From Swiss-Prot, chains A, B:
Residue range from the parent sequence: 157 to 369 of 884
Tissue specificity of this protein: Expressed in inner and outer pillar cells of the organ of Corti (at protein level). Expressed in granuloma macrophages (at protein level). Expressed in the epidermal keratinocytes of the skin from birth (at protein level). Expressed in non-neural epithelial tissues.
Domain-related comment: Three calcium ions are usually bound at the interface of each cadherin domain and strengthen the connections, imparting a strong curvature to the full-length ectodomain.
Domain of life, source organism: Eukaryota
Protein's cellular compartments: Cell junction, Adherens junction; Cell membrane; Endosome; Golgi apparatus, trans-Golgi network
Record bears the keyword Transmembrane: yes
Domain Cadherin, residue spans: 1-108, 109-213
Cited function: Cadherins are calcium-dependent cell adhesion proteins. They preferentially interact with themselves in a homophilic manner in connecting cells; cadherins may thus contribute to the sorting of heterogeneous cell types. CDH1 is involved in mechanisms regulating cell-cell adhesions, mobility and proliferation of epithelial cells. Promotes organization of radial actin fiber structure and cellular response to contractile forces, via its interaction with AMOTL2 which facilitates anchoring of radial actin fibers to CDH1 junction complexes at the cell membrane. E-Cad/CTF2 promotes non-amyloidogenic degradation of Abeta precursors. Has a strong inhibitory effect on APP C99 and C83 production.
Keyword rRNA-binding: no
Record: residues binding Ca(2+) 3: D134
Source species of the chain: Mus musculus (Mouse)
Positions with a binding annotation for Ca(2+) 2: D103
Record-given protein name: Cadherin-1
Length: 213, 213
């Protein structure tokens, strides 16, 4: 059977609703007056009424802004019924794909990460790892591509850049020498996670490093 | 059978070619690898290659700017063939409607219209009729809605507005009194026909009026 390929519809649509997606048609339009309807999740099943269809023209419409992180794909079924009340077609499967917008900030797995390092650890020694997730599309876009940075260091002694972070993995390492437990035993690093490879939306968390003997 | 409704494509398309129109699909995509093709006038028959289809994806494309005044409607047929060489679908009728642009100037049926009027004819007396046609869409648009005007009068005596024209019908009538055969026996009127109810493209012709006894 001839069918419509999956329809792509962007999430967070702005403006006037409803918006047209595609028009369906039964070739038995000539034989009899045909009326169109839709069933399935997104139509008559939860969430109800997100998609509607014009009964006479066959225009499939969307009634509200979509959220890809709530529902990313819809499977509907179109129906064709004559004025006499007989179904003139077998129900057609209609797929609606929701396409991504960068509307989710990266989120750290927890607010405070804790770590420790030996005082005499050589520069380049891995200490700890911070991690973040992103709810956006990590398959099609860079909307979930997280880059890690260090925003600030407290205290800024003996130098303000005692540690560094790997922007891909989130691993925090000793950058320079001069760590000293009996001078400055604790460091609070404010770490940032930004999507779009570092260019987009961002969030911050804390990395608390304790200096050991 | 489920079919695509007539596709509308504007004439005189500008930019990069080919341009996508619609995507077709056979549901037997899961069973076997399917290859798509198109037949009919506009595809493999004259005019050949105006519309093409991508064999694997099923994207119907247009390769060149259309001319509605040459061809206003195309009827194509889509085919679905498996990698094994069997037709997996009955050919589907695809209709392509060409939508109008205002790219045809109104054209008078002839260059010079001739007419005559009795000297003592009362103001308001019909003398002659000028007529024009327009190649554009007179059903859907105002692109063929012609309004008639008089541009100039030669000579401009005894007054410069001896005659007037009906902007709808093109009928030229005596506007004012003072026509005189033995003073000015001949008048050349330059008449204009403009589409968009008088606002669009225009052309001129001549109306030669001879004054009788
Ligand atoms: Ca969202
Ligand atoms: Ca998103
Ligand atoms: Ca994001
Ligand atoms: Ca020490
Ligand atoms: Ca044209
Ligand atoms: Ca035209
Ligand atoms: Ca015109
Ligand atoms: Ca006289």
């Amino acid at each position: 059977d001839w069918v419509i390929p999956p329809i792509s519809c962007p999430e967070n649509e702005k403006g006037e609703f409803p918006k047209n997606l595609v028009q369906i048609k039964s070739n038995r339009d000539k034989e009899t007056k045909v009326f169109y309807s839709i069933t399935g999740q997104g139509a008559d099943k939860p969430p109800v009424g997100v998609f509607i269809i014009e009964r006479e023209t066959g225009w499939l419409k969307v009634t509200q802004p979509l959220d890809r992180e709530a529902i990313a794909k819809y499977i509907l079924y179109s129906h064709a019924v004559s004025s006499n009340g007989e179904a003139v077609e077998d129900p057609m499967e209609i797929v609606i794909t929701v396409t991504d917008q960068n509307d989710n900030r990266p989120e750290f797995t927890q607010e405070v990460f804790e770590g420790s390092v030996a005082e005499g650890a050589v520069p380049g020694t891995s200490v700890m790892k911070v991690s973040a997730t992103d709810a956006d599309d990590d398959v099609n876009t860079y909307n979930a591509a997280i880059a890690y940075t260090i925003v600030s260091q407290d205290p800024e002694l003996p130098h303000k850049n005692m540690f560094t972070v790997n922007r891909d993995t989130g691993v925090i390492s000793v950058l320079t020498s001069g760590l000293d437990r009996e001078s400055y035993p604790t460091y609070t690093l404010v770490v940032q996670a930004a999507d779009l490879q570092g260019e987009g939306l961002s969030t911050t968390a804390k990395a608390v490093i304790t200096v050991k003997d």
